[PDB]
């Protein structure tokens, strides 16, 4: 099961450098809870554990990242990636 999100840069409170944020409605319609894993593909691809988006970002189907998770994936800031769950 997967959905398409646009990355983007986590909060600095945001603790978990594995830990990728994402709205409640696209947590339900990707069939993911908190705390499950999941996958990240661009080209490269990732796995890391989903916990709730920040309240407003539903409508923007954004996925939040720490800067050192997008470099892993080989990701910037604005890229469209697919979140599938594992």
């Known amino acids: 099961s997967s959905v398409i999100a646009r990355v983007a840069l986590a909060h600095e ?14 947590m339900r319609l990707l069939g993911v ?6 996958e ?6 990732v796995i890391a554990r989903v916990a709730l988006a920040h309240e407003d ?4 189907n954004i996925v939040r990242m720490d800067e050192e998770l997008m470099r892993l ?3 910037k800031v604005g890229d469209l990636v697919e979140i599938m769950k594992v």
């Open 13 to 26: 409170d945001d603790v978990g450098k594995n830990i990728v944020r994402m709205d409640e409605e696209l």
């Open 33 to 38: 809870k908190v705390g499950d894993l999941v």
């Open 40 to 45: 990240i593909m661009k080209v490269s691809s």
């Open 57 to 60: 970002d539903v409508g923007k």
């Open 73 to 75: 994936l080989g990701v």
